[PDB]
RNA sequence: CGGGGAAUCAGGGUUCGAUUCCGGAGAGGGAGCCUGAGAAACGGCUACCACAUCCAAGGAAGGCAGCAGGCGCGCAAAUUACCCACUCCCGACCCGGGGAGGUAGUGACGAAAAAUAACAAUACAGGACUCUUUCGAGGCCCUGUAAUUGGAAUGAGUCCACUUUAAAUCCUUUAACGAGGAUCCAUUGGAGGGCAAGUCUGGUGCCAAUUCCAGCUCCAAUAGCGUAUAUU
């Protein structure tokens, strides 16, 4: 209602198959708008589906009037699956990572180098 | 190797002699007249004025048609006119040597909130700015030392969310009106 | 008179070098024997072990009896005599306590009141004498 | 060290790249290639810092190794490939062409060119030698060797070369009265006509160049790239035409542009 | 009671010193 | 007759009044080398833990000024505490050092 | 270790530069090699010297002036944390790896910003102005001081949700609670011999002066302020 969306520095990136822009969000009396709402408003503005819109890096200014962030709209979901980082793709629920620590992978790697042969695969 | 910068400067100088009565009295006068927290704010503004006077004397040693004298004197005069300390008709490097600390103190946001009648006193002005009741053209400002430009002189407005401004009342007024 | 010749830089340099060697602050800071003979080893503070407690008599025009600690420094084994701010603070000090000691305050010079003491006790048992004397902290044993 | 270096610290990078202090401790470190380390613009800085298709180096890699970027008509997927003076960058997907030529402040301008201008480039001849079986060769400023050049082409002359094939198509002599652009030293980026070349045997020659506004400046002979024959350049020039304005007239132009719009 | 601190202590000292 | 004293603490307060009384008697008799271990930091919600530890440090600093607060929650931290115990500068008490006990 | 550089600054100078950029050197001390385009390499090898680990006593292994961490030394210095998302580097490589590096933890080194109250009525004390020669009158103002009243405004905190981010924290943004002795209580030093600041009080001893101790009053700067040492 009172939240409004403007897009400033628009660019059509044919090389990464997207549109990219800076998003100005006006919420004169609220908290900082969640990213799914901004994705829905950009989906209505740019006449597309909201699963190919990725927004990030929102900073609300002092005093609470305006919030600036970055956004991009991909041509398809496949290009979003190609070109987007894995973490921003996982923020939409589209990527899952190994639940393993650095210490675990590093100590397993250093334990496999004391064994030679396919018995390396028997090292936990 | 860190991606960090270590550049910073001190914004004041302590006085050379600690206990001189005339300097103490003059500093206390300016503190009381302008509603300042301590002596360090007087020393900060004194440091800014001393740097500007040093730049003016250095540019005054140069000959009149030196390109650096013209460029840097023009920029310094333009800045001093832009913050309202000098008059637009006095754009001449000789008049900078006649500037006083009181002009820089009058261009603060605390002093302008006092002088435009948004506050009943200078200390009321300080506590008003510090409590997010003041905005400058769109932007809520907490800093009493916010130096106001001549283009922002007419846009000191009064915080569209403040109880005395936009209208939504404070903690005490909702707590007290809830009793009855 | 001094020479002013335009080709006399070497003589001016040599003379200034010798005459800097005649300067007592320069000689202390550059000869090095002041730092080898200093009990602190050129540092600002030093820790020691309290050997004994003694009483040093004050100056003649203001007669008094001040109380001092004889302390052997840890890092070089040198013996020094250190000052305690009053007799109340001395009750916190016992033989064999690790004590942190500074200088008296006139930069290596002794006292104008107590003859021949240059060091003051700052901490004992890793707590300051100011904190013990004001009841802020207690010391262990 | 015990061998060659692989890292470039960001504050030790060339200043005309216009990198900042707080993004990292490292700069992109150009690969070995036809240009010097200090006189090139790497492809990652072009595609990210200047042209802003990419936000990270990983996006630069995703752009480059989809095989979209041609440098001098050849597809390059090295993100740190050293591109330098007079090099033509072609992006066929977006239909863009560029030449890396200098601003009046000594920085590689984003200079957009016409697709027919992207067919060729200019090279300064750095050495002429005769190789085996009496075959003459020239070596240019971008490590190009051409066999059988024109016998009139000498060192310091400029060849106009065709990027489709790589052969000599035209050339311009070094002569007093020809147009040149300065590619090094304190006068980097300025353009003017050569008025006097003084010779110092066993040392560096000094070329005197006069600007189109009548200003005169000297450089070494190494810093001179002859661009056009007499007075008309054979390539497109940036918005400034090699005319270095002083700080006073630049402030005046900025104030007039602010006054006219706003 | 308590003494004032900060800008208020200086305001009090100024009112004592130069006002009267 | 202790060579080292391991004091135990809770995250919220520093010590009890009984702990204060015991510490007064122990300081006054003579302390050997000591180490400070805290038991319930990981029992707290995460969003407070760091801040809680900071608060605890201040509550300790009035009696133990420059002393590290170890954590004793797991077997791994127990081994780290034992290693800190084994290799540490021992405080020497003169009375028991001059006599056979 | 040398420079770039830092403190001071009328000018000349004086002191500092172990330390993140550039160049050099070294990997416990020496010495000698192999491989490779590149090393006299030490997170390669081979000896000796100094230390030192395991052992079934035959043998085997070693090099934190890398990141953490420990002991020692001392006046003197942080976590055995998370991550390759950023910056870049390496590799057969768009995909793997990086204690480089990033991010949190400790951190009053130091630098910036900046709360700890404001206002109104009333009562006294002053200063202007009108009317009076004056005393005096001012529902005439102005400014101060409150064991006097009064609700207005807020942060500090507590704590949803967003935002932030690799994931988080913080900051910012916002609901809710949150101020009268607003006890939600500012400290550190110095003054009765000279720069700022004392005709003060009480104990305790010597022959009213006079040792030691505890206060009051005042002054300075202020989230900071003393001390030592070196230096300018």
Coordinates of C-alpha atoms in Angstrom, one line a residue, chain D residues 6-213:
Chain D
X6 CA 52.0 -14.6 -9.4
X7 CA 50.3 -12.0 -7.2
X8 CA 49.7 -8.3 -7.5
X9 CA 48.9 -6.3 -4.4
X10 CA 46.0 -3.9 -4.9
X11 CA 47.9 -0.8 -3.8
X12 CA 50.8 -1.8 -6.0
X13 CA 48.6 -2.1 -9.0
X14 CA 48.7 0.4 -11.9
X15 CA 46.9 3.5 -10.7
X16 CA 45.0 4.1 -14.0
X17 CA 43.0 0.9 -13.4
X18 CA 41.1 2.9 -10.8
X19 CA 40.8 0.2 -8.2
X20 CA 39.9 1.1 -4.6
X21 CA 41.6 0.3 -1.3
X22 CA 39.0 -1.7 0.6
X23 CA 37.7 -4.3 -1.8
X24 CA 40.7 -6.7 -1.2
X25 CA 44.4 -7.0 -0.7
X26 CA 44.9 -8.2 -4.2
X27 CA 44.6 -6.8 -7.7
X28 CA 43.8 -9.0 -10.8
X29 CA 47.6 -9.5 -11.9
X30 CA 47.6 -9.5 -15.8
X31 CA 48.7 -12.6 -17.5
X32 CA 51.8 -12.6 -19.8
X33 CA 50.7 -11.4 -23.2
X34 CA 51.2 -8.9 -25.9
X35 CA 51.3 -5.9 -23.5
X36 CA 53.4 -4.9 -20.5
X37 CA 52.0 -5.3 -17.0
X38 CA 52.0 -1.6 -16.3
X39 CA 50.5 -0.6 -19.7
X40 CA 47.5 -2.9 -20.0
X41 CA 43.9 -3.2 -18.9
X42 CA 43.0 -6.7 -17.9
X43 CA 39.7 -8.2 -19.1
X44 CA 38.2 -8.6 -15.6
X45 CA 38.7 -4.9 -14.8
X46 CA 37.1 -4.0 -18.1
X47 CA 34.1 -6.3 -17.8
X48 CA 33.5 -5.5 -14.1
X49 CA 34.9 -2.2 -13.0
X50 CA 34.4 -0.2 -16.2
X51 CA 31.6 -1.7 -18.3
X52 CA 29.7 -3.1 -15.3
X53 CA 28.1 -6.2 -16.8
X54 CA 29.5 -8.2 -13.9
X55 CA 29.5 -7.6 -10.1
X56 CA 32.1 -10.2 -9.1
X57 CA 35.1 -11.9 -10.6
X58 CA 33.0 -15.2 -10.8
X59 CA 30.5 -13.4 -13.0
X60 CA 33.4 -12.2 -15.2
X61 CA 34.4 -15.8 -15.6
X62 CA 30.9 -16.9 -16.4
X63 CA 30.7 -14.2 -19.1
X64 CA 34.2 -14.9 -20.6
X65 CA 34.0 -18.7 -20.8
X66 CA 30.7 -18.7 -22.6
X67 CA 32.9 -17.5 -25.5
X68 CA 31.4 -14.0 -26.0
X69 CA 34.5 -11.8 -25.9
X70 CA 36.8 -11.3 -28.8
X71 CA 40.1 -9.4 -28.5
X72 CA 41.4 -8.4 -32.0
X73 CA 39.0 -11.0 -33.5
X74 CA 40.2 -13.9 -31.3
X75 CA 38.1 -15.4 -28.6
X76 CA 39.8 -15.2 -25.2
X77 CA 38.6 -16.9 -22.0
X78 CA 41.5 -15.8 -19.8
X79 CA 40.0 -13.3 -17.4
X80 CA 43.3 -11.6 -16.8
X81 CA 44.3 -11.4 -20.4
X82 CA 46.4 -8.2 -20.9
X83 CA 44.7 -5.9 -23.4
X84 CA 46.3 -2.6 -24.2
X85 CA 46.6 0.3 -26.5
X86 CA 44.6 0.2 -29.8
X87 CA 43.2 -3.3 -29.0
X88 CA 39.7 -3.9 -30.4
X89 CA 37.3 -5.6 -28.0
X90 CA 34.2 -7.1 -29.6
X91 CA 31.1 -8.4 -27.9
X92 CA 29.0 -10.0 -30.6
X93 CA 26.1 -10.9 -28.3
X94 CA 25.3 -7.3 -27.3
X95 CA 26.7 -5.9 -30.5
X96 CA 29.4 -3.7 -28.9
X97 CA 32.9 -2.8 -30.2
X98 CA 35.6 -0.8 -28.3
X99 CA 39.1 0.4 -28.8
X100 CA 41.3 0.7 -25.7
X101 CA 42.7 4.2 -26.2
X102 CA 43.6 6.8 -23.5
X103 CA 41.8 9.6 -21.9
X104 CA 43.5 13.0 -21.6
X105 CA 44.1 12.0 -18.0
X106 CA 46.0 8.8 -18.9
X107 CA 43.3 6.2 -18.3
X108 CA 41.8 3.7 -20.8
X109 CA 38.6 5.3 -22.0
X110 CA 35.5 3.3 -22.7
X111 CA 35.5 4.3 -26.4
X112 CA 32.7 2.8 -28.5
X113 CA 33.4 2.3 -32.2
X114 CA 31.5 1.4 -35.3
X115 CA 31.6 -2.3 -36.5
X116 CA 33.4 -1.3 -39.7
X117 CA 36.1 0.4 -37.6
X118 CA 36.5 -2.8 -35.6
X119 CA 37.9 -4.5 -38.7
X120 CA 41.4 -3.1 -38.3
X121 CA 43.9 -1.6 -35.9
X122 CA 47.0 0.4 -35.8
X123 CA 50.4 -0.8 -34.6
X124 CA 53.7 1.0 -33.9
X125 CA 56.7 -0.7 -35.5
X126 CA 59.3 -1.5 -32.9
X127 CA 61.9 -3.5 -34.8
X128 CA 62.8 -4.4 -38.4
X129 CA 65.1 -7.4 -39.0
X130 CA 65.9 -9.8 -41.8
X131 CA 65.7 -13.5 -41.0
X132 CA 66.8 -16.7 -42.6
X133 CA 66.8 -17.0 -46.4
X134 CA 66.6 -13.2 -46.7
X135 CA 63.1 -12.7 -45.4
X136 CA 62.2 -9.3 -43.8
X137 CA 60.2 -9.3 -40.6
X138 CA 58.7 -6.5 -38.5
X139 CA 57.8 -6.6 -34.8
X140 CA 55.0 -4.3 -33.6
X141 CA 54.2 -2.9 -30.2
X142 CA 51.7 -5.8 -29.5
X143 CA 54.2 -8.6 -30.2
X144 CA 53.0 -9.2 -33.8
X145 CA 55.6 -10.4 -36.3
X146 CA 54.8 -9.8 -39.9
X147 CA 56.9 -11.3 -42.7
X148 CA 57.5 -9.4 -46.0
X149 CA 56.6 -5.9 -45.0
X150 CA 56.8 -2.9 -47.3
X151 CA 60.5 -1.9 -47.7
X152 CA 59.5 1.7 -46.9
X153 CA 58.2 0.8 -43.4
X154 CA 60.7 1.6 -40.8
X155 CA 60.9 1.6 -37.0
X156 CA 58.6 4.2 -35.3
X157 CA 56.2 4.0 -38.3
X158 CA 52.6 2.9 -37.8
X159 CA 51.0 0.1 -39.8
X160 CA 47.3 -0.1 -40.4
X161 CA 46.6 -3.8 -40.2
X162 CA 43.6 -6.0 -40.9
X163 CA 42.3 -8.1 -38.0
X164 CA 40.6 -10.7 -40.2
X165 CA 43.9 -11.7 -41.9
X166 CA 46.8 -10.0 -40.0
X167 CA 48.6 -8.6 -43.1
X168 CA 49.9 -5.1 -43.7
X169 CA 47.2 -2.9 -45.4
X170 CA 48.5 0.6 -45.1
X171 CA 51.2 2.5 -43.3
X172 CA 52.2 6.0 -42.0
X173 CA 55.8 7.3 -41.7
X174 CA 57.3 9.1 -38.8
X175 CA 57.6 12.6 -40.1
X176 CA 57.4 16.2 -38.8
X177 CA 53.8 17.3 -39.4
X178 CA 52.0 14.0 -38.8
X179 CA 49.4 13.4 -36.1
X180 CA 50.5 11.4 -33.0
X181 CA 49.2 10.3 -29.6
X182 CA 51.3 10.1 -26.5
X183 CA 51.3 6.6 -24.9
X184 CA 53.6 7.2 -21.9
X185 CA 55.1 9.6 -19.5
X186 CA 53.5 12.7 -18.0
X187 CA 51.7 13.7 -21.3
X188 CA 49.9 10.3 -21.6
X189 CA 46.7 10.7 -23.6
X190 CA 47.5 13.9 -25.4
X191 CA 47.2 14.2 -29.2
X192 CA 49.0 16.6 -31.5
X193 CA 51.2 17.1 -34.6
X194 CA 54.9 16.4 -34.5
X195 CA 56.8 19.7 -35.0
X196 CA 60.4 18.8 -34.1
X197 CA 62.3 15.7 -33.3
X198 CA 65.7 16.3 -31.8
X199 CA 68.2 13.5 -31.8
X200 CA 70.5 12.4 -28.9
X201 CA 72.9 9.6 -30.0
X202 CA 73.5 7.0 -27.4
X203 CA 70.4 8.3 -25.5
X204 CA 66.7 8.9 -25.9
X205 CA 65.3 11.1 -28.7
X206 CA 62.9 13.9 -27.7
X207 CA 59.9 14.6 -29.9
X208 CA 58.1 17.9 -29.7
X209 CA 54.4 17.8 -30.3
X210 CA 52.0 20.7 -30.7
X211 CA 48.3 20.4 -29.6
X212 CA 45.4 21.5 -31.7
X213 CA 44.9 24.5 -29.3

